[PDB]
Amino acid sequence: ASNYDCCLSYIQTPLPSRAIVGFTRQMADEACDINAIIFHTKKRKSVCADPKQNWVKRAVNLLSLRVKKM
Numbered sequence: 698a699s700n701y702d703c704c705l706s707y708i709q710t711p712l713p714s715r716a717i718v719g720f721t722r723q724m725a726d727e728a729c730d731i732n733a734i735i736f737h738t739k740k741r742k743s744v745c746a747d748p749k750q751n752w753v754k755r756a757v758n759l760l761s762l763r764v765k766k767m
Contacts, residue, residue, distance in 0.1 A: 703729030704745035711746060712738060714756040720744075722757070722764070 700707060704723065719737035723729055723745060734753045736744030746753045 701730050703731065703733045704735060704743055706745070707733070708736065708744045708746035708753075711750055711752050712736075712741070712744075713752055714759075716740065717756050720756055720760065722748075722760070 716738050717736055718739040721735040721737070723733040723735045725731045729745070732748045733745040734748055734757055736746055736756065738744060748754060748757055
């Protein structure tokens with residue numbers, strides 16, 4: 698096992714969604730072989746955070762209802 702070369706660079710530091718302005722979902726196939734969360738904080742470029750965290754899943758969660766009509 699080893700860290701892949703997903704987006705620019707994996708989320709070297711998982712920050713709270715309180716600093717996440719925007720984000721998107723990243724599929725496992727392209728430059729990434731795994732799932733990652735293309736974060737777009739207000740003080741950090743496109744961040745790639747694997748959807749296996751509490752902070753990530755929290756940000757992706759609000760999105761799960763956002764990118765899913767109900």
